[PDB]
Each structure stands twice: as C-alpha cells, then as structure tokens.
RNA sequence: AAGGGCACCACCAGGAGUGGAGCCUGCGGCUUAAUUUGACCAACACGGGAAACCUCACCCGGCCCGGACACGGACAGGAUUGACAGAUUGAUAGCUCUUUCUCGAUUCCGUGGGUGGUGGUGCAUGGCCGUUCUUAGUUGGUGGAGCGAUUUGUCUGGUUAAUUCCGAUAACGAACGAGACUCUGGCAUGCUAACUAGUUACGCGACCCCCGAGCGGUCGGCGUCCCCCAACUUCUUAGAGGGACAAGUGGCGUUCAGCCACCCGAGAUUGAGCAAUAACAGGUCUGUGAUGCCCUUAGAUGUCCGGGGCUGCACGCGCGCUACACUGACUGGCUCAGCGUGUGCCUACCCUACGCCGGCAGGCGCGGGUAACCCGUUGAACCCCAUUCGUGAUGGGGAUCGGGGAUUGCAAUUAUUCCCCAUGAACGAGGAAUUCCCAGUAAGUGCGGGUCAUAAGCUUGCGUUGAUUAAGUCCCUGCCCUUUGUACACACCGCC
C-alpha cells in the first residue's frame, strides 16, 4: 500500500542493509577474526549474529564492546530501541572459514613474516 | 466470530519458501481449518545488466545480474476465530510474511 | 625519445626505471623480515538532570 | 571551529548519553538527524568529534558514508570533568542496569 | 562564503544531486529498484546484496 | 598565475576600547545617550547604533532612519 | 624451416551490408582563455561519457577554512563572530571601503604538526576487467629411462565439439580444464492447486432474429467466494516429479571408439552462465574512507559561487540512422505481442485511467495502482485490405533554413525537447577495399529497461514477419600441436 515500499524495492533494500553492516562489521571486528554476518529478520524484531572466530574478543568487558556495536547498528539504521538484539557466534572449524585464514594472514604479513 | 485470513509468503530461494509453506499447510490441516490451495505469484525478476569491467576498456563485456522473487498466498477460512489457534509462523531467515484480513 | 606523439611508449619491453626491470629480481633472496621467502623459510545524565533541575 | 557552546555541550551530552555517535558524512547537511531540536549543524557534529578523536578521547570508524565514533576511558573523565559530573554517571555502554 | 551562498546552488535534480551510497561518486550510478549505487560498488556488492549470475 | 588583481585586503577590527556609551550625572544618574532596540528578542539591555543617517540594530538589524 | 589440425572476429556458396550521399555521435587535426582528460585485433555510441547549471576534472573571476591537535602569545578593561545603510562588486559575497552597532573563549596570531585533492606516476601497487582463449590445453603419485636438469605417462593411427574417447603401448592409476553442473526453451488434456489467472456449464439481460429457427447466434454485457450461491485446471501461473539415452532398425567402421540414414517420438546438437596451468610493464591511481612515493595546501591543484567550455570547423577516419523508390509513398479501414517498469532514508523527481478545453504539442479536475489487484485484454509496428500518385530528383528523400505555438527546469542564447505552416540539398544502389552471419538464424519491424527534471540516431533486452546458401576446405588470414635450428633465457621489443 502507499505507505509501505514494494516488494522488489523492500528486498534490494533489505540487501543493502546486509551489505552495508557487513562491510562495517568487516572494518570494526578484522582484528578479531570476524567472519561473516548472519541476520534473521521477523516483522517484529530484528536478529544479527556475529559469526567470529574470538567471541571472547567480540564481546568487551562485561559485553561492553557487543552492547556498543547494538547502540550503534541501532543509531545508523534507525531501528527503534529495543527491536533488535546482536549475538556473537564462535564459527566452528574456523581452518574451512576463507574469511579467517585470509585475515590471519594479513596479520601474519603485517607482523613482518616472511 | 467469522474470520478469514489472506498471508503472504515472500522470498527468493524457492527451497525455503516451499518448506515454510508446506509446513504452514500441513499445521493447518491438523487443526481442521478450511485451508484454499496455496497460489503461487508469478515470479519477480529484477535483472541488471552492467559492464563488467571498472574501466571502460574491453571487450564490452556485460553481467547480467539476476534476483528472483517468489510470492505465494495462503488463505484460511475458519468459521471460528482464527488468531487463537495460530499464534506460531515457524519463519526461517529470508522468508518474509504478511497478514492480512480478508477485508482487505 | 621512448614514446610516440600521443605518449605512448614504442618499446614496452624495454624497461625506462633503473631501480628495476621486467624480471622480478628479489632482493637478497628474499631474505629478511618484510620480504619474500627462501627455502629456509619454506622448510545516568537524564535521571541526573532531573534532579539537577529539581530544585 | 566556530562552534557555539550551546551546540558543544548538547554534543558532549549525547555523547555521554549513549557511549556511540553516527553520523553521515555530509558537510552540507543543515540539521543532525538526532537532537535536531539543538538546531546544530551535521558539520558541527563531525567537526568536534574530529577535534575529540584528534586528541584521542574517542575512536573513528567508517563505513560506506558514515563515521561510528566510539567513546573512550580517556574520554570519560574528560567528559566528566567539562560537564561537572560526578564519577557516578555514565553511558548505557558503560552500564545497563548494573 | 556566508550563509547565502555557500550551497546556494539548485540541486533538487542532475547529476550533481544524486550520489553513491558507498563511495560518494557521480557516475554510473545505478538507480533501479532504489540501488542509488555505483556501477562498480555494484559489482562489488552484488553476492551480498543478492542479486546472482544465472545466465 | 600572476593574477592582475594585487592581493586582497582581509579586514582588521580595531581592537577598539571599552564602550562606556552612557553617562551619569550628579552622583549617578542614568542617560542612555544612545537608542535602544526595541525588539523583543533583543531586549532592554543591548543597544541601537548611532550612524549618521540611520539606526540599526546590532543583532535583530532593524533599521530607522531619519529624513 | 617442415609436417599435421582448427576457426564465418578464415575462406568457399551466399545473404545483408559498410566504404559512395545527408545527418547523429566518437577520435585526430585546426582553432581557442579553455575547447579537461584516458584509451590508438585486444582505442575511435568506449570511460555505462545522451556535459545548458551541477556533473567538471579546463578557462575567466570572486567568497570561505570545512588548517584537527600541541606549545607560546593576545585576551571578559575583550581572543574574537556577524551585520542595516551607502559605495564597490555580476552578486541582496559586510569580499572590501566610510560607518557604528553586535557576538563572548567557541576563536585569533606565531611556531610545529595536520588534512583534503577527478593532481602525477597503471612503468610503484591491490582488486576488477579485457586478450592469448573458450582454443584444448595443464599437473601429481607409483613404476621405467636415465649421473643430472629432466623424460615417459601426455602416443604412429582412428574418432570427437573437446589429450573426447578407442586403440597402440614402459607404463598403471588419477587430478584440473572439456564434460558433468546451474539457469533458460521445447513436452506432458499425468499430480498439487488458485475471486490478484481463468475456462466450461447454467441463470438474468442487450441485439439480430421472427421464416420459427430457440440447447439459434454474438456479447471483455451482468452474474453464479456477492462464500452457501456450479464444477474444473484444458488454456494462465509455479512447484515436485517424469521424459532423450545414439535408446530402436539398416548401413559403414579394427567391427572398437564412433559416424550416416530412417522409424517412433515434443525434442535425435536450444541458448547462455561458470570456466585450467599461465602470460600480456594490456586498461583503470577520473569508482572508492583501495593504496606507496612525489606535487599542492590559504592568492589552494582543498572547497563554494557566477559566467564560459567540454558542441567550438579549410580537413581525415570509426560505430551508426535515413534514404535513393511503384516490392513504393500518402489517405482510410481492419487486425495481432512479449520482455519489463511504475509514488523515492538521504531525494526535491512515479505509472497513468476517466471526463472536460485546444487543431497539435499540451492544459484542467477526478480517481486507481507500492502492483498476476490499476495503466492493461499493454488495440505496437511491420504486415493485410481499399484510395490517389505514375518512372519524372517525381506525391521518393527530408537535409538546410524562416516564422509561430507548448513543455521541463533556477536558467533553453551557442537553437534541450515537442508541435504547426513554409524552402526542398545531395542521393538514380555506391571505386579500391572491407564487416557480420547457419534456423526462428540473417534481415525487415516496432516495444521496454539504463542514461533521465527534459531527453535516444546509443546500449541492453523482448516480441512480430521471416529467408538464400552450406553440412566442406586449408586457397587467403590467423591460432594450436609435433619435428627441427638456436650463440635467445629480462627469452626476437632477444642477442649481437
Ligand atoms: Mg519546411
């Protein structure tokens, strides 16, 4: 109806939006072996995981750190308080993980091996 | 009370979208709600066809970008209430629903 | 000399910087810390305002 | 910077409210999209969060077009201390519920 | 300068108005179905966003 | 380069003194010898200009002239 | 250098053309304040590059700091910020000049230090793309030959679209690529179903009927999920299953791999996507908050604003569009599609029905549609059927140019686009040369998307009508494999 988008535009923009957060969750948690996102979205509330291959890092102290990035995915898309919630997921067999070993190499490279 | 309700399905793997409604059917009919067939949209096709090269020199070569949306509708028609008995939608990510009333 | 009226070069084998060339020639054998490898290698405030505007 | 105090404290007060700040990166954009009540400029905005992140107080990201300013410790007690706060208050990130 | 003129100009439409939402370039933006992308940030994000090579 | 413009002059404020543009008289009393503004947002504290024509309002830059 | 093999970016046999003419557009050149720039099979309607402003990178000018932070000064007896009037300026830029107000530690000045940049270098790089090459090529293990590097496997031959297989055989067993795969098209009167697709049947109508037809004919007329008030999925949609495998027969073949023809069959080769080891100093730093170094950084190569330019014309070239006519043009009538889009975070801008005004371009109200719900049964063009013209640069062609009228935009001049009335240029099938192509194909022919406030002679798709020739070869042009020669190995753009 005329307040609502049409399908095709809802899920390009639906996309988007995965997209884009994975783009910024690539950039904030590289250091920590972040490897992918996966968002479950109902009409209600939305749900992300975080798979990564340190939860222990993804998460601050006290889920500072998870808490911060909740706030903040919050603030960008404007999602109203309390409508969607971010979980961090250790990915089993991080070796098969793409993702990971390439960001473990450039770690590596970075520290100067050869 | 007389109650019908029209929902929608939305997605773009056909594989999903048929579990979540064959399912959906499947509960229904335990619970001996008159359910019509579930109809299948015809499918959405957005295509985008860019060049594939970032420069411009080549030889003109183009993707062509394809993204299926697949519709289906579902309709229950109970001579009861119909809200109370179905209070679970058992969605999986990607699968997008829509209530609607028969009114509608 | 190297290149045509347009600018580009007649001979693109013909390597025109003095540091390197068309080979990659490694240095020192890829030895050192940033470098290739070698064999070696290999093997509240709104609760707060509140009672700060109270009174 | 030109930047009023009106616009700096109302800033720094959001900035202590929650522990994040966003903000699209349009020099040209009249209003901040949150506190447009304030009536200060997005480029005010980015302004004094490039001057906190110069002086280390708060940590810059960038996404596609957008800056992700996370607060600092060191940012905390110098918020603390330019708005006379006692060491009781502090973000949601900092604390929920506890 | 001042108030007045500084973004003066009207851009309610043009090239000028329209930009990428990733990389804030004016050219080969894509604007179907609400992309506002650009034809290589497209290219980039095609995989994520869900759009797959079939034929 | 070389442009055929010399170099623009940028303003200088004279650092003027201390206002002191109303006087008391026998042991202090009040004589704004300049005008006041009279709009509402500018209130009854700041003051009108003194030019030679006309009198403009620092802030709310309303002008009355005289002919 | 020799021998084999392959290919409509090779030919043959042809088809349609291009190069001949006009014009659009892109390069070079000339000119210019600038006419920004990249690129020279694998550049030249390419940078999705159809630029009025923006874009914009170039030129002519003028504002602004959006120069963080550190140190030291200056400073509430003011660091400093703006601004009415006049000049001044294109400017209603307090940009500056006279001018007095106003702003309150945010700034300002100096010294260090940032930062930005469509600035340079693609011959410093990443990624991506193009090409060699979509050719058929590429590599382990074990075993054999070797003192080694290595070689055999990976081959005389047959066969295949394919080192695809069969065979020979110091090799045997494999792997990548090919294939397989995914998508798409072709068939299911078989399954699941559908008031956002409908179809039959039936009921009310509306008309031709009356000779009377009467279960007569037409109806996209109204209805029968107006849910109690029919069924069904054939047509439509979209899911799962099937179906095709050289399977059957004859012939040829080592009688193997396979090849030819025919029957039954919807189909006996539907198109794409993906795509190896590698190489190209191939292209992009003008896609990027991809990026090293260099350049500039306050009179800016930052950023903004005004105007101009990207179009500029003795000339050359490339992709194209329209024509040269009667197989036609004009006028009228009849009659048929499929892709696919459609109201916006920012973002201002949607597709349009219906009625009314005007001759047209258009204008004004009134809806519908966030969509199999509305445009829309997409009444498309070509074509078909009738009229006139009549071999005449002619009723072909509509280039050039005058006048007028609308639309979008802040702005239409260097004419944005559209409409109307006028002039009517070459052009009478195009030299040397040269491009593309094998079946729903070429070609004719229109309609969508992208670009877009306005914009298609471009591109990407779709549909309609619909062929001639060929089922071969290495002649030309190339590429690949083997043998061979090598003083090359940064590898012939070599060495000397
Ligand atoms: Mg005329």
């Given at each position: 109806?005329?307040?609502?988008?049409?399908?095709?535009?809802?899920?390009?923009?639906?996309?988007?939006?995965?997209?884009?957060?994975?783009?910024?969750?690539?950039?904030?948690?590289?250091?920590?072996?972040?490897?992918?996102?996966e968002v479950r979205v109902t009409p209600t509330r939305t749900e992300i995981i975080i798979l990564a291959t340190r939860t222990q890092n993804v998460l601050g102290e006290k889920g500072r750190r998870i808490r911060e990035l909740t706030a903040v995915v919050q603030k960008r898309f404007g999602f109203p308080e309390?409508?969607?919630?971010?979980?961090?997921?250790?990915?089993?067999?991080?070796?098969?993980?793409?993702?990971?070993?390439?960001?473990?190499?450039?770690?590596?490279?970075?520290?100067?091996?050869? | 009370a007389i109650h019908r309700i029209r929902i929608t399905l939305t997605s773009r793997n056909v594989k999903s979208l048929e579990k979540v409604c064959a399912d959906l059917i499947r509960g229904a009919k335990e619970k001996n709600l008159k359910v019509k067939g579930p109809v299948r949209m015809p499918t959405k096709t957005l295509?985008?066809?860019?060049?594939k090269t970032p420069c411009g020199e080549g030889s003109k070569t183009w993707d062509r970008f394809q993204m299926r949306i697949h519709k289906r509708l579902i309709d229950l028609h109970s001579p009861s209430e119909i809200?109370?008995?179905?209070?679970?939608?058992?969605i999986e990510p990607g699968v997008e629903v829509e209530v609607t009333i028969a009114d509608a | 000399d190297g290149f045509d009226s347009r600018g580009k070069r007649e001979?693109?084998?013909?390597?025109?910087?003095?540091?390197?060339?068309?080979?990659?020639?490694?240095?020192?054998?890829?030895?050192?810390?940033?470098?290739?490898?070698?064999?070696?290698?290999?093997?509240?405030?709104?609760?707060?305002?509140?009672?700060?505007?109270?009174? | 910077m030109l930047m009023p105090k009106k616009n700096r404290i109302?800033?720094?007060?959001?900035?202590?409210?929650?522990?994040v700040m966003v903000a699209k990166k349009d020099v040209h954009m009249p209003k901040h999209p949150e506190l447009a009540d304030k009536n200060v400029p997005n480029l005010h905005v980015m302004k004094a969060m490039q001057s906190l992140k110069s002086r280390g107080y708060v940590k810059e990201q960038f996404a596609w077009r957008h800056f992700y300013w996370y607060l600092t410790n060191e940012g905390i007690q110098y918020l603390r201390d330019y708005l006379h706060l006692p060491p009781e208050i502090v973000p949601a990130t900092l604390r929920r519920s506890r | 300068g001042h108030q007045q003129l500084y973004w003066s100009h009207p851009r309610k439409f043009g090239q000028g108005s329209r930009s990428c939402r990733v990389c804030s370039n004016r050219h080969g933006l894509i604007r179907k179905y609400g992309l506002n992308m650009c034809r290589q940030c497209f290219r980039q994000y095609a995989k994520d966003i869900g759009f797959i090579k079939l034929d | 380069y070389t442009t055929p413009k010399k170099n623009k002059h940028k303003r200088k404020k004279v650092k003027l003194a201390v206002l002191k543009y109303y006087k008391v008289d026998e042991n202090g009393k009040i004589s704004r010898?300049?005008?006041?503004?009279?709009?509402?947002?500018?209130?009854?504290?700041?003051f009108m200009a003194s030019h030679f024509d006309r009198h403009y309002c620092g802030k709310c830059c309303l002008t009355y002239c005289f002919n």
């Open positions: 109806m005329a307040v609502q988008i049409s399908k095709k535009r809802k899920f390009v923009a639906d996309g988007i939006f995965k997209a884009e957060l994975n783009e910024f969750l690539t950039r904030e948690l590289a250091e920590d072996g972040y490897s992918g996102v309390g409508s969607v919630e971010l979980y961090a997921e250790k990915v089993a067999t991080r070796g098969l993980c793409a993702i990971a070993q390439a960001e473990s190499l450039r770690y590596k490279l970075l520290g100067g091996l050869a | 295509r985008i066809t860019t060049r809200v109370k008995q179905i209070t679970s939608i058992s | 001979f693109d084998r013909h390597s025109g910087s003095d540091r390197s060339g068309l080979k990659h020639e490694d240095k020192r054998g890829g030895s050192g810390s940033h470098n290739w490898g070698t064999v070696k290698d290999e093997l509240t405030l709104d609760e707060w305002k509140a009672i700060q505007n109270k009174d | 109302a800033i720094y007060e959001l900035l202590f409210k929650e522990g | - | 010898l300049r005008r006041e503004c009279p709009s509402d947002e500018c209130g009854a504290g700041v």
